Design a binder for these strands. Structure first.
Ligand SMILES: Nc1ncnc2c1ncn2[C@@H]1O[C@H](COP(=O)(O)OP(=O)(O)OP(=O)(O)O)[C@@H](O)[C@H]1O
Lengths: 247, 48, 252, 366, 52, 100
DNA sequence: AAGAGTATGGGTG
DNA sequence: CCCATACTCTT
DNA sequence: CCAGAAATTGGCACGAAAATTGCAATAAATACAA
DNA sequence: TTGTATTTATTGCAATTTTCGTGCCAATTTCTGG
């Protein structure tokens, strides 16, 4: 279902296969639309935690004042309105994988709240006096440059070394030129099957056009372009005229 | 004369038509017995 | 139809019809097998590294002290699961050859008869396609409805039939046992529920053969499938060897 | 136990089909046709459906027509008719030509049957070019025919309902009680509940305590439900007491608020309790919600239940002159002489609810 | 203002006390019997008077 | 609805109702054979839906025919005799007919 | 350690 | 009443 | 006999009243520990 | 002597929908004088 034809992507696949026995947290970095989610789910699938939960969490959608309650849970009577005990996402993802998406959007006052949990795995619930120990593997994804954010001062240096034991960098689509045509054919077949059209390839000029456009949205932009071309097709082959949005 | 359901009808039709000949079949009580024995967990079946 | 039993149940025909096929196959007294099946005593399935044989009967206190002494070195069970495990773990060929050697060497009269009986049973099992553990029921067949119809009476009352009553009792016991096993109830209740399910299945198959018989409102025992099959009022003697016919009359 | 086989209309029809010199194709067509016959004796599908169900394209519609014509002469005569006109014409075709009014009846059935359905007797008489006497004889001959020939072989038994409340008259007083043959009840397993002791494991103790408390709560809930139902039924019977002595036309109008105030509850509880509950009385079996009705004002400051007015309308219609039926203006006047102040439109609505045709469709030649 | 916070406060809270055991009134005898059968299945300590 | 004992059965002829009185019960002293009607009774079969064909049937042949069906008591086949006694039992609270 | 005798349970009518 | 099997006394 | 006139019927409307359904967890009496 | 944890005792309020009676009027049926 996934296309890995560029040599860099095959090297990344070899790296993923070599760390299938590890439990250290992983840090995935790149541009937008390069496939960080794909790589994260592939890392989860090939490891020993294949059947274990995969909790994907967007850390930017958690309100500031209830961050601790969401992450760690609370006990009964902790505050006004706490009518029953409730667990957090670290207990929910216990024994499995926790995937923190867009870790670079977290604020400096919220990054300090998960410094001991990532390394030790032990924490206290809100209002609880017993220490809870969990076994969670942490994958983190970011589209920023953390190694530069820490130098600037907008990212805590204490969290980068806790998260970045293993670092993966996914190159942009404009450098994986051996993947543009296979991905185009894959998306074309998928969307032709979905919309019941009768297009079954590209012309010798459309392929040349697809290899020169500097894809800035990467694979997501390529997918959108292919879907739009399939929706408005008129024959059996896609010509350069249809792909006029490129250039 | 007793429990061949299709045989009864065929025999009656033949008698009305003036053709005194029967086409015997399987009695229904034997099928009931087979079902009852199967309901006891025993595999009993007709062969060939 | 079929019913998925929550726990395995033994077939009363292969336990109570003398000689007992289960007992003759496992070489055990009928009393001990009955104690194990109806949750009265334990039985060792795997002896382990201790001084416990593969078919020793353990009481409640004996099993408790065995657990307190040895721990997880062995395995003991009660009910139809233990009997099924014993039946599934036996090898027919090794038993056949060992007993043939013992018969060839030893000379006696009663023991020779016992060995001949066991050899005949084992060779009959091997020659046929059957398996011993098939004598423990896991799925229960259900008769077609038109062979067990409901009785319509004046006033709209439908009453009930013995077969339908037995099926309803079995279904109720099975559903309660499933619910109790799902909620992880204490063992003291689930053992009683399993015993009652075994009794209900026995009543459905052959009512009255094992101990007491379940009766109706007028203190009459309910008719089971065996009652439908056998006897002077059964299928063979009432419907197959003789029957009522058309084109007949009678007079003085 | 076992019952006995019964012969239905379709069994008799197939028995006659078996002993009829059909071909294999004709026999299959006859089987489909008999399958498409209801218990009143009428064909329920068009012949196109039968032709499609046969399953081959070598057969035309006229063969189906011939087989249907052959079948329609089975016993009873008129079975498997397409519509009422077809059944009447088939029944008439079996009569001898010496019948006095056969020709006029045949003409009326073949051509003018909707006019007879509208009870015209004016346009029908004009078109048929005939006098009243011969027209009346033809109508009487038509009405002697069988409209439902398939009911000769009748099968089935009526369905019943078990009452929840019994109302009787003991020592001259109307008494109300619950039906002991259907009152739900539960119990507590003493054998299981006798092991609720701290000697055993604490998990067993908490399990058994929770289950015992839930069981006791459920038993209390059932007991309260039964008591509430009995109280509501007793209040309802006490309020509507002239009905149980003199039947309808003596119903009093009442709503849920009256019973709610009488028993000191909320009308929501009264509404929920009386839902799908039945009461057995010497007059019959009635749903508990049958005793609540609207009302129309009565001269003198009183009120009249709509049930009583409907019963009065039915009784007044049932005892009229067949030649000159009562309209709604006449029924309104015959009700005003008794003090009932009801409108013409309401009387029309009441008559429609009783499934009674208007006045112009009830008149008779006689 | 409008916000979501965890805090310790002193408040006067309202009192809901109904919907308990109210659905049994509108059930007919047959549906009530089915509910009782389900409750018997789910509760070990509940039994029904038997005729056998 | 309740079953009604009546002399007005819509699906039987006038000759077959000749031995019944005004209450639908046979006279004392009548000679009867197999198939004759002793007590005339009808069973409700009404429905709240009226199809156009049902409306046509009710308009042409009357509403009584479409509401009830015959459930009368008939002499069993192979039985004959003379009516010598008739008894009527009525539940307390139900109105009595002429015969009672 | 086997072998003959007695008590118990199943089946039939 | 008659037969098969488990338990008990004896050579 | 005919055509105008009068009577009948039921569909739609409108305001009001009655019936139905969603809500889901508390309050008080009682027995026991300092 | 009291303060607190436990066990019975709680079967209504408030929207929302549905049903009620009765008027307006067009289409339809029936009646009557020249
Ligand atoms: N090798 C590939 N084969 C097929 N589809 C791919 C591949 N790489 C990426 N895609 C597609 O590209 C799209 C965008 O990928 P993805 O969601 O991983 O990007 P992202 O912006 O890095 O992720 P996120 O922001 O969700 O963490 C998806 O629809 C995915 O299916």
């Amino acid at each position: 279902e996934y296309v890995f034809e560029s040599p860099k992507m095959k090297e990344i696949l070899e790296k993923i296969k070599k760390i299938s026995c590890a439990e250290c947290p992983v840090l995935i970095t790149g541009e937008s639309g390069v496939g960080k989610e794909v790589v994260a789910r592939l890392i989860h699938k090939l490891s020993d935690r294949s059947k274990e939960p995969f909790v994907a969490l967007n850390v930017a959608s958690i309100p500031r004042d209830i961050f601790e309650a969401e992450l760690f849970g609370y006990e009964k009577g902790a505050f006004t309105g706490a009518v029953s005990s409730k667990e957090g996402f670290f207990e929910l993802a216990d024994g499995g994988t926790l995937f923190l998406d867009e870790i670079g959007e977290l604020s400096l006052e919220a990054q300090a709240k998960l410094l001991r949990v990532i390394e030790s795995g032990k924490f206290y619930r809100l209002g609880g006096r017993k220490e809870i120990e969990v076994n969670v593997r942490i994958l983190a994804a970011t589209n920023r440059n953390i190694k530069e954010l820490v130098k600037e001062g907008k990212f805590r240096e204490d969290l980068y070394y806790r998260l970045g034991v293993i670092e993966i960098e996914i190159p942009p689509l404009r450098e994986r030129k051996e993947d543009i045509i296979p991905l185009a054919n894959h998306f074309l077949k998928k969307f032709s099957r979905k919309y019941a059209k009768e297009v079954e390839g590209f012309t010798k000029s459309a392929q040349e056009l697809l290899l020169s456009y500097p894809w800035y949205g990467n694979v997501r932009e390529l997918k959108n372009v292919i879907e739009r071309a399939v929706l408005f097709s008129e024959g059996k082959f896609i010509d350069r005229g249809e792909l006029s949005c490129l250039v | 004369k007793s429990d061949d359901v299709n045989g009864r009808t065929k025999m009656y039709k033949n008698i009305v038509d003036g053709n005194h000949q029967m086409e015997p079949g399987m009695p229904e009580s034997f099928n009931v017995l087979l079902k009852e024995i199967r309901s006891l967990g025993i595999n009993i079946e007709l062969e060939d | 139809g079929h019913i998925e039993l929550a726990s395995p149940t033994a077939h009363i025909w292969f336990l109570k019809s003398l000689p007992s096929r289960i007992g003759l196959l496992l070489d055990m007294p009928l009393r001990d097998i009955e104690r194990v099946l109806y949750f009265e005593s334990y039985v060792v399935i795997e002896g382990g590294m201790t001084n416990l044989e593969r078919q020793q009967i353990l009481t409640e206190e004996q099993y408790l002290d065995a657990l307190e002494e040895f721990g997880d070195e062995f395995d003991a069970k009660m009910g139809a699961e233990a009997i099924q495990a014993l039946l599934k773990s036996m090898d027919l060929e090794q038993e056949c050859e060992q007993l043939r050697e013992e018969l060839n060497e030893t000379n006696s009269e009663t023991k020779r008869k016992k060995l001949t009986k066991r050899i005949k049973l084992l060779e009959a099992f091997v020659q046929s396609g059957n398996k011993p553990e098939w004598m423990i029921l896991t799925v229960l067949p259900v008769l077609p409805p038109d062979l067990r119809p409901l009785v319509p009476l004046d006033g709209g009352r439908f009453a009930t039939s013995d077969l339908n009553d037995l099926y309803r009792r079995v279904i109720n016991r099975n559903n309660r046992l499933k619910r109790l096993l799902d909620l992880a109830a204490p063992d003291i209740i689930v053992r009683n529920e399993k015993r009652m399910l075994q009794e209900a299945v026995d009543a459905l198959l052959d009512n009255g053969r094992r101990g007491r018989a379940i009766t109706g409102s007028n203190k009459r025992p309910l008719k089971s499938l065996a009652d439908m099959i056998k006897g002077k009022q059964g299928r063979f003697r009432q419907n197959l060897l003789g029957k009522r016919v058309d084109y007949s009359g009678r007079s003085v | 136990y076992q019952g006995e086989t019964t012969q239905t209309l379709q069994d008799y029809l197939m028995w006659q089909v078996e002993l009829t010199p059909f071909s294999d194709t004709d026999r299959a067509i006859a089987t489909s046709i008999v399958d498409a016959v209801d218990e009143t004796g009428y064909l329920t599908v068009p012949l196109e459906d039968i032709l499609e169900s046969i399953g081959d394209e070598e057969i035309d519609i006229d063969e189906v027509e011939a087989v249907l014509k052959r079948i329609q002469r089975f016993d009873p005569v008129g079975v498997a008719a397409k519509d009422l006109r077809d059944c009447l014409l088939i029944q008439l075709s079996q009569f001898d030509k010496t019948t006095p009014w056969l020709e006029e009846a045949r003409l009326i059935i073949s051509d003018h049957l909707d006019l007879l359905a509208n009870h015209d007797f004016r346009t029908l008489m004009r078109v048929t070019r005939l006098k009243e006497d011969v027209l009346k004889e033809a109508v009487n001959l038509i009405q002697s025919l069988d409209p439902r020939p398939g009911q000769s072989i009748q099968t089935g038994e009526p369905e019943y309902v078990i009452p929840d409340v019994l109302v009787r008259k003991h020592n001259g007083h109307w008494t109300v009680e619950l039906n002991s043959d259907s009152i739900p009840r539960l119990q507590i397993n003493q054998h299981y509940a006798s092991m609720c002791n701290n000697a055993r494991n604490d998990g067993d103790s908490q399990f058994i305590r929770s289950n015992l408390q839930d069981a006791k709560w459920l038993i209390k809930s059932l007991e309260s439900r039964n008591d509430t139902l009995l109280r509501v039924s007793r209040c309802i019977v006490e309020q509507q007491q002239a009905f149980f002595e003199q039947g309808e036309e003596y119903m009093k109008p009442m709503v849920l608020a009256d019973i709610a105030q009488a028993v000191e509850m909320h009308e929501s509880t009264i509404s929920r309790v009386t839902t799908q509950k039945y009461l057995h009385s010497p007059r019959g079996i009635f749903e508990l919600k049958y005793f609540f009705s609207s009302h129309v004002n009565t001269e003198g400051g009183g009120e009249a239940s709509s049930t009583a007015i409907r019963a009065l309308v039915k009784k007044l219609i049932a005892a009229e002159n067949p030649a000159k039926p009562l309209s709604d203006s006449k029924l309104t006047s015959l009700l005003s002489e008794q003090g009932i102040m009801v409108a013409r439109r309401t009387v029309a609505k009441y008559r429609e609810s009783l499934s009674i045709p208007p006045s112009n469709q009830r008149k008779q030649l006689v | 203002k409008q916000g979501l916070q965890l805090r310790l406060s002193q408040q006067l809270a309202m009192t809901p006390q109904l919907q308990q055991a109210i659905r049994l009134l509108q059930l007919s005898t047959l549906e009530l019997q089915q509910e009782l059968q389900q409750a018997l299945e789910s509760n070990p300590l509940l039994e029904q008077i038997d005729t056998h | 609805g309740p079953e009604e004992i009546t002399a007005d059965i819509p699906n039987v002829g006038e000759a077959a109702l000749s031995k019944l009185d005004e209450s639908g019960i046979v006279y004392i002293g009548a000679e009867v054979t197999g198939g004759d009607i002793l007590v005339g009774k009808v069973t409700p079969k009404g429905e709240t839906q009226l199809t156009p064909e049902e409306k046509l049937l009710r308009a042409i042949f009357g509403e009584k025919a479409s509401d009830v069906k015959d459930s009368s008591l008939r002499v069993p086949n192979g039985v004959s005799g003379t009516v010598i006694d008739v008894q009527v039992f009525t539940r307390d609270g139900v109105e009595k007919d002429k015969r009672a």
